[PDB]
Design an enzyme around this catalytic site. Structure first.
Site, short mmCIF file in Angstrom:
data_model
loop_
_atom_site.label_atom_id
_atom_site.label_comp_id
_atom_site.label_asym_id
_atom_site.label_seq_id
_atom_site.Cartn_x
_atom_site.Cartn_y
_atom_site.Cartn_z
N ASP A 156 0.84 -1.21 0.00
CA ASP A 156 0.00 0.00 0.00
C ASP A 156 0.87 1.26 0.00
O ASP A 156 1.31 1.73 1.07
CB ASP A 156 -0.87 -0.03 1.24
N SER B 70 -0.88 15.85 -11.63
CA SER B 70 -1.13 15.53 -13.03
C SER B 70 -1.37 16.80 -13.83
O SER B 70 -1.95 17.78 -13.28
CB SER B 70 -2.34 14.58 -13.14
#
Ligand code: SYG
Ligand code: NA
Length: 330
Positions: free
Chosen positions: A35, A199
């Site tokens: 994770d 992004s």
């Protein structure tokens, strides 16, 4: 040193991926959910409340000649989905894919919440976010990656998740055969303890690319792609009959649909998520409503590039002094 381990979907939907991990002496092999959005290595154990164990493999510290109680240390974690676990702590030898760390904090669960109990395929978590998020008290512990780092050939690990197929976690090297083209690196903020990046925009299907900054985290432990409501609305508007269902808890679409792809930007580069990756199948067995793999991050307080996005790329988690993320097509 390096390590290389295969990671395998737990089910037909790629809800999560499990990776075998050797703990203790002699080795006890447990299948852990790696994770990159959390920082605890915790396992089902011989200490876990018996009624909360249903088919998981347990770690038994008393059978490990290298296990030592980390006296006084406790842990308790709450995840984004409301699940939680807690317990006490041992140090032991932990190996992943041939890479060994001695003295790793292995957090032994005394209690796990029902989502953990119900899932017999996940024997615990191995956190790969920054060690600042580790929940051990009173002495915070390091992640497996942070403890391995100085031994590694290069201070990196890579995630190469499969779509309905196994993939690979590598530690200490970048497999130049595992991706196409070049890797585009992007800046990371560690201020919230995550692999947080920005992004450069998105496109829906064959549509024009929209340049827009989308802060979010690269999270191998989250199934879906969670993005701002504007972006998510623009995606699902291209699918006949898709709608946001408060009853189901997100966007659903007719199972008869063909989904468009979704592109996200990494600097000047583009990662394309095929439409099929965004299908999470019937909302209940036999339903003709299907659950979408792109969902709104409204109310979560962060955008999450979970497995839906990550599995479309070869992803480099660069843990150099100044961390960065890299993405390549594959
Ligand atoms: C992601 C697999 C799912 N069955 C699950 C397993 C354990 C804990 C939480 C949770 O949502
Ligand atoms: Na579900």
């Amino acid at each position: 040193s390096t390590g290389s381990a295969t990671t395998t979907p737990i089910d037909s939907l790629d809800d999560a991926y499990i990776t075998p991990v050797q703990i203790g002496t002699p080795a006890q092999t447990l299948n852990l959910d790696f994770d990159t959005g959390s920082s605890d290595l915790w396992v089902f154990s011989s200490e876990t409340t018996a009624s909360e164990v249903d088919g998981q493999t347990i770690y038994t510290p008393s059978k490990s000649t290298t296990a030592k109680l980390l006296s006084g240390a406790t842990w308790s974690i709450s995840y984004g989905d409301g699940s939680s676990s807690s317990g006490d702590v041992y140090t032991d030898t932990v190996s992943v894919g041939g890479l060994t760390v001695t003295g790793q904090a292995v957090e032994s669960a005394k209690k796990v919440s029902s989502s953990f109990t119900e899932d017999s395929t996940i024997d615990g978590l191995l956190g790969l976010a920054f060690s600042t998020l580790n929940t051990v008290s009173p002495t915070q512990q390091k992640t497996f990656f942070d403890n391995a780092k100085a031994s590694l050939d290069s201070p990196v690990f890579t995630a190469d998740l499969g779509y309905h197929a196994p993939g690979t976690y590598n530690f200490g090297f970048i497999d130049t055969t595992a991706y196409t083209g070049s890797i585009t690196y992007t800046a990371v903020s560690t201020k919230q303890g995550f692999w947080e990046w920005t992004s450069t925009g998105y496109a829906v299907g064959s549509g024009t690319f929209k340049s827009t900054s989308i802060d979010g985290i690269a999270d191998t432990g989250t199934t879906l792609l969670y993005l701002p409501a504007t972006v998510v609305s623009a995606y699902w508007a291209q699918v006949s009959g898709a709608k946001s269902s408060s009853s189901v808890g997100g966007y659903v679409f007719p199972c008869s649909a063909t989904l468009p792809s979704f592109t996200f930007g990494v600097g000047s580069a583009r990662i394309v998520i095929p439409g099929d990756y965004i299908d999470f199948g019937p909302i209940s067995t036999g339903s003709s409503s299907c659950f979408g793999g792109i969902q709104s991050s409204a109310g979560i307080g962060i955008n999450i590039f979970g497995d839906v996005a990550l599995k479309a790329a070869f992803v480099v988690f660069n843990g150099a002094t100044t961390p960065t993320l890299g993405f390549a097509s594959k």
